[model samples]
Target: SMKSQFERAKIEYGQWGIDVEEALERLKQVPISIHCFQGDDVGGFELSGDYPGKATTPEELRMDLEKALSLIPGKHRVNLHAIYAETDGKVVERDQLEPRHFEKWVRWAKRHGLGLDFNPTLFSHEKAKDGLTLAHPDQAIRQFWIDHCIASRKIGEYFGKELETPCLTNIWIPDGYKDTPSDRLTPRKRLKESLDQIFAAEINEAYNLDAVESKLFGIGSESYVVGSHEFYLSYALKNDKLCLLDTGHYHPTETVSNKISAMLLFHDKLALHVSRPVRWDSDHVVTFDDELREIALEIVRNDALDRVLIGLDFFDASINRIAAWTIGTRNVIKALLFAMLIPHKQLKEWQETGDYTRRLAVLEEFKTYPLGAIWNEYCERMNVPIKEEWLKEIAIYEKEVLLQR
Candidate 1:
């Protein structure tokens, strides 16, 4: 029955010049990197932060990851912030961090057939009291953060080598003033200096790729974000490093879909932090909504799948954690599949030929096709739970795992 459904769907979409099997193959080829913090609610075993039930054990984290990956299909990567480092019963300062700190995670990822990505923990630290880190006025404070970032890149490179996949070592600092600052230029200059120091070492490009993320504003720093979009965009273009565009990091109305083509025109590649925002930067679980579909459409239409690195960024501890990852990851893949289902060549031809009436009619007709059938087949091929079967798995996992905690 499933084979018949896929066959029918394939022939149906083929009339529009879209190949369903080729789309599934393409979707499977691109791995969606899932953020490790979603299961723990961004509560890493770092020096700061309050985890009332006590910090998470390495074993507990491994168990949770095991469950999360089971429900989600495909070979994916787990993204880790520096705060998730395992210290092995010793107080390891961030500046003194080495690859050994994350060896436990490295081995776990290797065992699970997953890739790894690293992020510098630039928030929730004693040093972050001034609401500044990489852009701090104190030279000592700046150097400490710089050392941490430099060490993070090396650790990322190590993860890449050990896991045999190029690690995306990303840099994001919560450095900004709460209100209007008299000297914005100095802060920007200092941030530039700090970044220069952090990136001073030339780690080979084979093992790792450097990415810088920008935010318009953060929880505390509402007015002046040192690493604004313009600031990081200019740096990413000049330095040839990848720029990560977080969907929730931009203003409420500004969509990330519009920036994809523009970003690709400059940087050779760009990284994506996919998350749904609710009126602000709430980091809600992603859905198959307008913005998400548009973002996927941009990548699929422009044929920039290889040039973009897709990763999820969100925190939803209020509900089932594994379900959060499963839902978001599945929805993203489905969105990409939906994009692939679009007859881009056919639409483009109509537009060029001034057939707006036909184009409009065809677009609405494509929506009513059996996309759900094709999606289930994709899930079947990947050996993941199809449709609401994933929900049943999530419920069982919660009863057995999360409920105990």
Candidate 2:
């Protein structure tokens, strides 16, 4: 029966330019999560805001989103922009109006049958230039940031309160590590204090508390740690926060899979941003190039299926949004499916017996079914010819891949 289902899936995938191998690869990776850096209103054409461009109206954007949704598979969520406008006092204007824009977006998504996620407190590029500022630490301007954060939560609450959508309010400050190791201590303290305030706010919100049926499902955290995992773990455990692991955020030498395994062992919620590193830069590109593919497999090996959320973190302006989304989704699914199909008993035996040589062989076997080959197979099975134009589009990434080699 499973085999037949796989065959059927292969046929369906072929129609979409996918092959059996690709389908198999994807099926191994079950449950998918999608994400966008900021709300779709890039130049603010849709939302009522101060920006100059041929912005799509909210109604128009809604239609556009519906069209995009139809093209991609699995659950969908979006990261929200934080702190709209900064004034002198602790009074900050909510940049992306949660109630007006987000609520409208949620309602539209629901009408078209979709899910949503919210990322709170985006690092302001402008603010980052001046140096990282916490909403709760600065006595003078602290309240300003805090108020913005409060408003941000309210936007999240609107979804939970009015629509009953499953939302994850993520808090990540893109604060860089200090040059002097000793200076790192202050930022950490400030981060903790800021989190404490937000945590209290989360408790105060009756809607969020009750929305998950008291299951504690909505809140999560993402941080660029300057210290060891032990320090980060202790902080997360004390606060009862889930770790949103950014695959590229770790040091180049750090092992992502091991880190993920540790997090999952503690029953922490895991959200992954699937992107490859460029030297030291976090260039959010898709592809399991180099050792990254092996790292990805290790992460998937420990995935909990339903709780796993995979996302593309690419932020380049040159990339065609839909195309990038499609490739990213396709590859991620393939990797996941491959992992799912692995014989669990074999993995268990290897783990229990400490037979790492066998484990390495199995992992190599997994990687042999590379994502590109899987994509081509998917195309073949779908009976969809890989178009010349598609090939050309892929060439752009190919050039980047060449650099990797």
Highest lDDT: give the candidate number.
Answer: 1
Query: Each candidate's lDDT (Cα)?
Result: 0.86, 0.48
Worst 10 residues of 2 by lDDT: 210-219
Q: Cα RMSD to native, each candidate?
A: 2.0, 8.9
lDDT of 1 by residue, 79-174 (tens): 999989888777889999999999899988888889999998988888888898988889999999999999999999999899888999999988
Model 1 score (lDDT): 0.86
- What's the lDDT for residue 222 in model 2? 24
Worst 10 residues of 1 by lDDT: 46-55
| Model 1 quality (TM-score) | 0.96
Give the clashing residue pairs of candidate 1, or none: none
- Candidate 2 local accuracy as lDDT? 0.48
lDDT of 2 by residue, 75-164 (tens): 455444443211222433443334664545666656754545555553443434434545323553544454555566676676656655
